[PDB]
From a paper:
Green fluorescent protein (GFP), discovered from Aequorea victoria, emits green light after absorption of blue light. GFP has a β-barrel fold, and the chromophore is formed at the center from the three amino acid residues Ser65, Tyr66 and Gly675,6. The protonation state of the chromophore differs between the two states, A and B. The phenolic group in the chromophore is protonated and neutral in the A state, while it is deprotonated and negatively charged in the B state. Spectroscopic measurements of the photoreaction of the A-type chromophore revealed the presence of the excited state proton transfer (ESPT) reaction, and a photoreaction model was proposed that includes the intermediate (I) state in addition to the A and B states.
The A state is stabilized in the T203V and T203I variants of GFP, while the B state is stabilized in the E222Q variant. The X-ray structures of the T203V variant and wild-type GFP were determined at 1.2 Å and 1.48 Å resolution. The conformations of the residue at position 203 are gauche- for both. Gln222 in the T203V variant and Glu222 in wild-type GFP are in the same conformation as Gln222 in the T203V/E222Q variant. On the other hands, weaker hydrogen bonds longer that 3.0 Å were observed in the T203V variant and wild-type GFP as well as the T203V/E222Q variant at pH 5.0. The side chain conformations of the residues at position 203 in the A-variants T203V and T203I as well as in wild-type GFP are almost identical to those in the I stabilizing variants T203V/E222Q and T203I/E222Q. This indicates that the conformation at the position 203 is the same in the A and I states. On a plot for the two structural parameters, the three states appear in different regions. In other words, structures spectroscopically suggested to be in the I state (T203V/E222Q and T203I/E222Q) is positioned in the low right area in the plot, while those to be in the A (T203V/E222Q at pH 5.0, T203V, T203I and wild-type GFP) and B (S65T and E222Q) states are in the middle-high right and low left areas, respectively.
Author numbering: 2 to 64, 68 to 231
The structure:
């Protein structure tokens, strides 16, 4: 199909986020590339407003599931690529257990040959010395499954999943995710059977980078359907 063919090679990625969390306003710019043939993402993010007022790991899911590797036998379930190049809206509520929430609205689409993720993020109800505003989360990331289901009235999909962020005391900060995606364009899009994305993510630092930043290497494979 038209959309899937845009992802057979390495595709440059740009990410741009504006955020307001409890009145802390910030912006992040990211660059990198994706190779959906291998489910592979490499991205580097820079906070362009100074210090990021929330922990970098809490923004990983917000900062391009069109780069998931869908096995050939699951091609008919890949909503994300099918919406391209016109793109999709991706909205979430991320609920941090016993703390605040993020609401995110993003548009993921091509600008020329570059895949762009533009996000507006709003966070409210955070505790001043909770794990988020108190910066008590470890700089690392666990592997998780993203459970996808069709959302036919929206011509799209929804997803649910639980992210667990390690806390510096050894505990875990749960971030429940609810997600809805809607296509922007008028091409046919794929409405999938239930399945999941199996994600692993590794966070690192650029030793030469003095701005506040995050390097992400991520691998994602679609799964849960045998034929
Ligand atoms: Mg292929
Ligand atoms: Mg069927």
């Amino acid at each position: 199909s038209k959309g899937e063919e845009l992802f057979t090679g390495v595709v440059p990625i740009l990410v741009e986020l504006d955020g307001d969390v409890n009145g802390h306003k910030f912006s992040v710019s990211g660059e990198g590339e994706g190779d959906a043939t291998y489910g592979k993402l490499t991205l580097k993010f820079i906070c362009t407003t100074g210090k990021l007022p929330v922990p970098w790991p809490t923004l990983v899911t917000t900062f391009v599931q069109c780069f998931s590797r869908y096995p050939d036998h699951m091609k008919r379930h890949d909503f994300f690529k099918s919406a391209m190049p016109e793109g999709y809206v991706q909205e979430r509520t991320i609920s941090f257990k016993d703390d605040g929430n993020y609401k995110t609205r993003a548009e993921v689409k091509f600008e020329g040959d570059t895949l762009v993720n533009r996000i507006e993020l709003k966070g409210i109800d955070f505790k001043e010395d909770g794990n988020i505003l108190g910066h008590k989360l470890e700089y690392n990331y666990n592997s998780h499954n993203v459970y996808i289901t069709a959302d036919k009235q929206k011509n799209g999909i929804k997803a649910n999943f639980k992210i667990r962020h390690n806390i510096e005391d050894g505990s875990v900060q749960l971030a429940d995710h609810y997600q809805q995606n809607t296509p922007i364009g008028d091409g046919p899009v794929l409405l999938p059977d239930n399945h999941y994305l199996s994600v692993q993510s590794a966070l690192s630092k650029d030793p030469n980078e003095k701005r506040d930043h995050m390097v992400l290497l991520e691998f994602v494979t679609a799964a849960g359907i045998t034929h």
